[PDB]
Design a protein around this ligand. Structure first.
Ligand SMILES: NC(=O)CC[C@H](N)C(=O)O
Ligand SMILES: NC(=O)CC[C@H](N)C(=O)O
Ligand SMILES: NC(=O)CC[C@H](N)C(=O)O
Ligand code: NA
Ligand code: NA
Ligand code: NA
Ligand code: NA
Ligand code: NA
Ligand code: NA
Ligand code: NA
Ligand code: NA
Ligand code: NA
Lengths: 414, 414, 414
């Protein structure tokens, strides 16, 4: 079976890439390779990333337009309400789990908040669709007292495109016969993009191998990081594993009484792609393919939930942010009252939506939680030493939550 | 009736926003609110602006393609000739009225001209459509003697998109059966964008309220501006009122013997949206909706004239530019001969086309008239103190001229 | 016949533009005209360039999608293999001819190579289609040892768009009935863009006249250039003439036993447009029109080969690069062994693909050959004095090779 062959090839890609990176580092790593030969060594992973980012846009737009135009606006609204409830509850549970793990294990033994949320709202409503295709609104500060002035910076505004696609699909549904032509157009475009996804899946193993090989070759050494941040890394990774292997599967089983680990086997490939790429947006294409044809999720439910979740639902990001907040508080020996914990949870849950879903997109918002909850911000300099791995662990769970919620809402629809 | 309800809500939005801004300023204004809370206070207006600018592009492009493909190229050429004649004559009349008011009341008691027009011509023929969707060609100067070097700067090139849409629609018409598919596609897209416009119209009241509230909260105080520029403000606003309430309605009545104030009631909402947003491009979406369904203008005539006029026809801009030129000449006590007045009129009429139709887009060209007609340029520093209001007054009349010309050409077609 | 009238008008445009430029230079040139009047003088050529660049994008994309969707993937693969073989062989022959001419006549009596090829590969796989529509990936260097860091710089990524269009057309072919709607859509769009091309062809004469008039008016004087670079100019131009009038027609005749000069008469107009614009991308629109309706090349074969070749096949560029390499080696009296010559040929052939097909796009890569083959790079400062003409001579042959290969593959298909 080609699906099992692809899954095996992706697992072997991850393992052999770890092995190749370890062997290259033992042979000297970047210093032995040199900057030019190092850049040439990690290139296939960059090609995989580029290939995925090339199709993020048309796939997301067309799939969401078709999905929103495939349902009654009332039914679509109810489905979206349930999906948002599931996303929010899972993110809150991940935040609480992260805080609890950080408090129990005790691993620790900028932009304004208002400006961050206003930028979120601005990106939700893009001022230009073509610009939104490759730029997002971001606020910097001038001194005149700090005055916030904003501009469009590099980075696809996936959130604004998602919102516009949903709204445009609802409009097409409202049109009736006149909008059917555009529905057919976008469905055909999405099917072609899905064919491209199927072709890119076969290159995904090589890209993942080289991604992981380069990222572990880029390290100074395992000891230098772990001897100082081992308990923090353990907190983050263990929370991710508990949420993805126990909590989320538990919820799926209780609401969808089917074997969740079969569902996870059906998406092993996009999970490894998320680990390799460290971005939910780039692995979303593969996740949609697998969830549609490897599992029994309906086409419209998948194409409506997965793209929305990949931008709004981020359980790993919230867990990492809470663990980081508690770790920084413990480093400074700051007291954490119940109000303080609730504030951490709420701020992490709210910022997870604003996370751009791109590599190193959690540290940008971590300062927001460290500001809402007054804590030393400079200590983030430590987290960046291990963010290259915690971010991948976060992306894995982030896309896993999307897939499991899509399955759960498929069961609810059925 | 929902139309009358929306009109009443928009009028109440303008009035209550003025009241809210006055109350906030009396309570202290920005200093009492603070920069963060001020930014949060004016946000809904920015959201309305973003929502409108999001749909300017697809609406303009699809509507113009469909309109140009809906008529015989000869009939389309005759319609465009009549529309251009009407626009030019109305702009010349506005320029003459502004000059006459400035001379009678006597309120006054950079980029090269060639480079400005070459940039206009370049933007008319965009070098890239995707870039034109969010950028426009602009010329800066290097010293080597000043050499003009140009680049693409932020700002949608609505003029180039309009020209390309008209040309592409004519091409589709030339194709015949083969082009009908694209005509259907663009008509469906425009209808969906019009549904989005209908949804945005219901948020327009809140956005307008907050826009006006913030803009009058941003003031230092009414006295500081008026005690020095009251007669200039009076000249500009009175010329706008005379042109929009007497001259343009008079022309509409003589050429279209119907009550023009009923037509103006049919578009009160986009007029208030223009006042709030200070941009003809952003209020064009709402103007098209109203002119199509609130008045009896045909679909093709509206979708061909309104988008063209919103970029080419600007009577308020020309009136303001002439009043500013005469005001600056009177400040410096410069003599204005008949040749001088004719030059002012011609330059203002020509630059009105080049005006980008965006907030504060008239002061950019005012220097062009002050250069063609040698006058002190530095004095523009005064006008910027009141441009926030004169520009809104200009945009109101600018969109009003579009609507009335669309009605007049509808009568001519009938 | 309108075709012969257009050809005559374009030839007269070239000749009369040379005459006008010579007359203006004799009257003083830029100094007599002045910077403003000079900028106004050369404007029509810039308008022609903008008009062509406006349609490069939709034309290339839609034509390639339709062509790739019009053939069986196996047949399309065989056609592409033959086209690539022809392109590579012709480019190698041009490189060898340039090297031989430089060695016989002896006219001579930055970015890393790996980074250049990695940028080529990145542009082949664009990370964003909207960004690719007007930007291309380029690598600069930071000092930390030089570390290569890359970003998107201005310039349409025609190569990535070509690859994506071919892949998307193959995907549409794979879809079957569901993809036929998109095939029809893109065919209609390409036909409309071709109508626009037909309209732009009639303005092409004026633009070409003013282009050549300005470019020869921009000169200091013929003597200052020729008295020092005459034999190099002769080598380049004579190699181009030999390849375009003897070698390429010879190959066409042997593989397609028809009069090649009739085929060249059929494309005289795009050849002169290439000479005037100095860009294969901008003249590709006209070349497609002529090759389709002036000669007997099939629609799909043209729309598949011409856009691919205009980015991949550049015989003139390779010839110029080889002549420049040998000229610089002779200036420094560097020995050229057989290995050295083979390296020059291979590097020029490989870099010709990476050439962006835009004015002055050969000198960017010339340093790549001068680095792979260690030679003084500074001497390129001389070539820039004559690149304005050699680049045009290169573009002529570059598009001529595309047209002749399209005809040859048409014969092969027949
Ligand atoms: N730490 C995080 O989860 C940041 C976002 C993550 N890189 C993603 O794309 O899902
Ligand atoms: N003063 C003016 O009229 C400038 C243009 C105006 N802001 C508009 O968009 O119509
Ligand atoms: N010297 C060259 O051939 C560079 C590329 C050339 N300007 C073209 O577009 O074909
Ligand atoms: Na969640
Ligand atoms: Na997600
Ligand atoms: Na998010
Ligand atoms: Na007018
Ligand atoms: Na207007
Ligand atoms: Na204008
Ligand atoms: Na070749
Ligand atoms: Na070519
Ligand atoms: Na090339």
């Amino acid at each position: 079976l080609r699906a099992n062959l692809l899954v095996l090839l992706t697992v072997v890609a991850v393992v052999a890439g770890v092995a190749l990176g370890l062997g290259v580092s033992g042979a000297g790593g970047a210093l032995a390779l040199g900057p030019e030969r190092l850049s040439a060594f990690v290139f296939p992973g960059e090609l995989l990333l580029r290939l995925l980012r090339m199709i993020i846009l048309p796939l997301v737009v067309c799939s969401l337009i078709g999905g929103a135009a495939s349902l009654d606006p009332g039914a679509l609204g109810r489905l979206g309400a349930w999906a948002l409830l599931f996303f929010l509850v899972t993110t809150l549970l991940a935040s609480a789990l992260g805080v609890g793990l950080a408090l129990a294990l005790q691993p620790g033994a900028s932009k304004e908040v208002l400006d961050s949320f206003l930028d979120l709202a601005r990106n939700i409503f893009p001022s230009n669709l073509v610009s939104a295709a490759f730029r997002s609104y971001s606020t910097t500060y001038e001194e005149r007292v700090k005055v916030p002035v904003g501009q469009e910076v590099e980075g696809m505004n996936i959130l604004g495109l998602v919102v516009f696609a949903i709204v445009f699909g609802v409009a097409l549904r409202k049109l009736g016969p006149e909008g059917e032509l555009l529905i057919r157009f976008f469905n055909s475009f999405n099917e072609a993009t899905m064919v491209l996804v199927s072709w890119i899946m076969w290159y995904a193993p090589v890209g993942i191998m080289f991604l992981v090989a380069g990222k572990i070759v880029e390290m100074e050494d395992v000891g230098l990081l772990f001897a100082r941040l081992g308990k923090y890394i353990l907190c983050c990774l263990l929370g991710h594993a508990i949420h993805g292997l126990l909590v989320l599967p538990l919820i799926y089983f209780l609401f969808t009484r089917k074997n969740p680990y079969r569902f996870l086997w059906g998406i092993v490939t996009p999970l490894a792609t998320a680990f390799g790429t460290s971005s939910s947006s780039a692995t979303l294409p593969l996740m949609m393919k697998c969830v549609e044809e490897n599992n029994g999720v309906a086409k419209h439910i998948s194409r409506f939930i997965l793209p929305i979740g990949a931008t709004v639902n981020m359980d790993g990001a919230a867990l990492f942010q809470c663990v980081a907040a508690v770790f920084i508080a413990q480093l400074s020996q700051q007291s954490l009252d119940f109000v303080k914990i609730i504030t951490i949870l709420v701020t992490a849950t709210a910022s997870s939506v604003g996370a751009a879903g791109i590599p190193a997109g959690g540290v940008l918002t971590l300062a927001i939680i460290l500001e809402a909850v007054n804590l030393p911000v400079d200590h983030i300099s430590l987290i960046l030493a291990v963010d290259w791995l915690v971010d991948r662990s976060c992306t894995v769970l982030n896309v896993e939550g999307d897939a499991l919620g899509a399955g759960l809402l498929q069961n609810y629809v059925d």
